[PDB]
Amino acid sequence: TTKSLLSADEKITESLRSTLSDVLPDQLQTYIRTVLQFSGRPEGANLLTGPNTEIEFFSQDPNKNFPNIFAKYSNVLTVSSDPNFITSEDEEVKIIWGRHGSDSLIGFDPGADLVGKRRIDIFLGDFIDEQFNPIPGALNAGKSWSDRFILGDWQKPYYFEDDETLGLNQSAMILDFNPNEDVIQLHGDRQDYELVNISLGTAIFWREKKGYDLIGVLGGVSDLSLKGDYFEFKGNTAPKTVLKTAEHIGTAANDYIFSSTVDAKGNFYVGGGTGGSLGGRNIGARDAWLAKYDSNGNQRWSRQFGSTGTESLWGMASDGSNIYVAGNTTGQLENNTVKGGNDAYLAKYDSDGNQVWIKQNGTYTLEESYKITVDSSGNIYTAGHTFELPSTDGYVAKFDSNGNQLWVAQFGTITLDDNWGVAADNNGNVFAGGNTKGSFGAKNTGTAGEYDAWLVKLNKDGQTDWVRQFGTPNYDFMWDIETDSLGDIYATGWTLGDLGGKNAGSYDVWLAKYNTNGNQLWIKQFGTSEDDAPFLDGIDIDANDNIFLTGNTNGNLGGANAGSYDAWAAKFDKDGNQLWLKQFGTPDYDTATTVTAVNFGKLYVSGITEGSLGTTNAGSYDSWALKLDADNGEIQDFNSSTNTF
Numbered sequence: 001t002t003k004s005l006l007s008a009d010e011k012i013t014e015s016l017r018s019t020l021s022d023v024l025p026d027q028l029q030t031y032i033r034t035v036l037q038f039s040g041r042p043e044g045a046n047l048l049t050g051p052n053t054e055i056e057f058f059s060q061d062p063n064k065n066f067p068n069i070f071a072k073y074s075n076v077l078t079v080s081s082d083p084n085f086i087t088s089e090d091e092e093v094k095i096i097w098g099r100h101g102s103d104s105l106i107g108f109d110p111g112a113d114l115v116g117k118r119r120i121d122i123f124l125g126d127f128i129d130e131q132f133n134p135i136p137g138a139l140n141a142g143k144s145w146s147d148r149f150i151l152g153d154w155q156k157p158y159y160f161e162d163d164e165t166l167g168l169n170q171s172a173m174i175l176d177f178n179p180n181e182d183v184i185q186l187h188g189d190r191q192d193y194e195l196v197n198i199s200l201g202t203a204i205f206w207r208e209k210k211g212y213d214l215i216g217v218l219g220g221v222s223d224l225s226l227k228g229d230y231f232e233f234k235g236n237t238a239p240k241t242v243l244k245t246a247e248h249i250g251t252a253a254n255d256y257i258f259s260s261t262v263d264a265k266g267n268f269y270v271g272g273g274t275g276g277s278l279g280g281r282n283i284g285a286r287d288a289w290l291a292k293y294d295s296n297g298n299q300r301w302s303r304q305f306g307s308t309g310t311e312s313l314w315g316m317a318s319d320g321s322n323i324y325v326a327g328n329t330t331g332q333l334e335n336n337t338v339k340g341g342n343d344a345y346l347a348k349y350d351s352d353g354n355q356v357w358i359k360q361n362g363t364y365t366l367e368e369s370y371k372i373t374v375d376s377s378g379n380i381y382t383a384g385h386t387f388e389l390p391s392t393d394g395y396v397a398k399f400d401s402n403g404n405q406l407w408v409a410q411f412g413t414i415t416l417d418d419n420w421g422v423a424a425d426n427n428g429n430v431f432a433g434g435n436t437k438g439s440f441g442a443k444n445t446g447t448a449g450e451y452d453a454w455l456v457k458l459n460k461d462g463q464t465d466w467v468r469q470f471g472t473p474n475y476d477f478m479w480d481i482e483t484d485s486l487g488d489i490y491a492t493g494w495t496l497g498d499l500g501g502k503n504a505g506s507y508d509v510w511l512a513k514y515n516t517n518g519n520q521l522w523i524k525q526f527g528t529s530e531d532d533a534p535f536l537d538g539i540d541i542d543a544n545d546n547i548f549l550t551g552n553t554n555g556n557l558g559g560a561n562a563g564s565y566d567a568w569a570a571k572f573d574k575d576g577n578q579l580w581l582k583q584f585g586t587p588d589y590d591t592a593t594t595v596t597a598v599n600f601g602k603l604y605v606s607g608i609t610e611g612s613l614g615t616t617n618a619g620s621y622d623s624w625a626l627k628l629d630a631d632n633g634e635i636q637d638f639n640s641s642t643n644t645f
């Protein structure tokens, strides 16, 4: 069996070498080989057989530049504790990079058709910016977080070919697993696995009577045990259902709500991304989707659209009757226009679920867009960022109801500026907000380029009225903004510092208010000793100027934690007094992603879960929508109405 262990090392080495060298671009192979060579890790370097190729950043062809090449083969997540909210089965090899925070990393979609496909997901739990940045004395120097690498769920092991081979065509490769801190999540129980010592570290094999299948390789770690607390086993039964009052949305694939809205008749909409056939037949990898509910909880229609590439619905807004939707695509959604491979889109749906038009910005420059708003006059605003040194800059774009572009405003600093907010006032003006490593509206007090929050006010012509910036010396991260009926601008985010008050521990939530003239009115901060943050579409403001916030916590923020991260929602008045704070979820990972206030004192909070929220989990990530009473945060049945029982 010594001979069998030697044969496994050869077959794994030759299989990974073949796939990584065929798929990864030569610029990426060259960088990775240099890091491994410099660290004297030849076993890793010798997996990459492409020629040494110069790394380029200043080509006139964006497609020849390292960031654009890297973008195709990566999911680069945020400074937050992130679920992989950008996962999609669109490449054979993908780098999944958590960066700071306690990330819940998945790359595989167990509901996708991957029979016979090569799949390697390369996981970096941390590999925080400070590890690459040579400047000394950063606040977050040496910091690491507990990352969870998801290699199976209650339904099935991931990367499983279930055949007569060692199952080398599909595998995870985890590069920075720390058994003192991180977790590897597996299907089944410890009797279903064998650990094998290989040249690269540890091989995790699925083992049954019929044979062996490689599930993952743990780079640079040896002599682990399946009895370790760093392995979490999910068994083979769906989790018990909680919150049967929720609307449940799920397929066997990874399904996400990322946004919601309401129209002038009280119809409630949700939308996001899916790796499955949720609102229609899957077109390939992740698709965008949206669904309409009447004011009584009844689904009217669902729609799914996209490409063989990756797209999501990240924002939606209504003019009262139509539903405008925005997000990102790696495909070509508008047949009149070229595809850049990483492009913003805007589409218009009518109340009957017809796609009236779609507009795509087909340029080769990397573009992301997570935010949309509609004004009184029915004009549409989107916001996002575009990536002569390499860097993101913010933009706002204004359109008419026929999808004609009225103007585009681009702005920012010499360094990273990301957009996480757009909101119109009732007065022809539009606000944007986001994160910057630089000094955009103030000198950034961060000594190693830690993020601050920024806000811009633009007028009806896209000219800048003002820029503001606020922050601590540590990372502060904005997720979302909204206007009230007076035209004041509110932003929400997390901080690792003392922004509105003394940090309670780890990530805390903040809520900032500026007046229309750029004066900061107040910043509130709240949290537990644990990780608390709003997320994605995390603020809304009703007709009465009540502020609603939503996101996730792994503490006891609104009540006892059910397990992992839970969702939370809060109500504030326009002077920043907290009126209520509710927490809800499953024993498994949950987060809210969006909040929509409606009328008759009801509110919808929607999000994602790895558990059974509303009904039995259909596979991996599922989504949910909860109807709350706006007076006290009490959960109502989604289908509750005054005319039914």
Ligand SMILES: [Br-]
Binding pocket: 040, 041, 042
């Ligand atoms: Br060497």
Ligand SMILES: [Br-]
Binding pocket: 077, 078, 079
């Ligand atoms: Br980020």
Ligand SMILES: [Br-]
Binding pocket: 130, 131, 140, 141, 142, 143
């Ligand atoms: Br470091």
Ligand SMILES: [Br-]
Binding pocket: 086, 310, 311, 312, 327, 328, 329
């Ligand atoms: Br996307």
Ligand SMILES: [Ca+2]
Binding pocket: 077, 078, 079, 080, 081, 082, 098, 099, 100, 101, 102, 103
């Ligand atoms: Ca992260």
Ligand SMILES: [Ca+2]
Binding pocket: 098, 099, 100, 101, 102, 103, 125, 126, 145, 146, 147
């Ligand atoms: Ca991390």
Ligand SMILES: [Ca+2]
Binding pocket: 125, 126, 144, 145, 146, 147, 178, 181, 182
């Ligand atoms: Ca980690």
Ligand SMILES: [Ca+2]
Binding pocket: 159, 160, 161, 166, 167, 168, 169, 170, 171, 213, 214, 215
């Ligand atoms: Ca396998």
Ligand SMILES: [Ca+2]
Binding pocket: 283, 284, 285, 286, 287, 288, 306, 307, 308, 309, 310, 311
């Ligand atoms: Ca797709």
Ligand SMILES: [Ca+2]
Binding pocket: 391, 392, 393, 394, 412, 413, 414, 415, 416, 417
């Ligand atoms: Ca910039």
Ligand SMILES: [Ca+2]
Binding pocket: 446, 450, 451, 452, 453, 471, 472, 473, 474, 475, 476
């Ligand atoms: Ca800061």
Ligand SMILES: [Ca+2]
Binding pocket: 504, 505, 506, 507, 508, 509, 527, 528, 529, 530, 531, 532
């Ligand atoms: Ca906290």
Ligand SMILES: [Ca+2]
Binding pocket: 562, 563, 564, 565, 566, 567, 585, 586, 587, 588, 589, 590
């Ligand atoms: Ca939970």
Ligand SMILES: [Ca+2]
Binding pocket: 250, 251, 252, 253, 254, 255, 618, 619, 620, 621, 622
């Ligand atoms: Ca699912």
Ligand SMILES: [Mg+2]
Binding pocket: 278, 279, 280, 301, 302, 303, 304
């Ligand atoms: Mg449908």
Ligand SMILES: [Mg+2]
Binding pocket: 480, 481, 482, 537, 538, 539, 540, 595
């Ligand atoms: Mg919002």
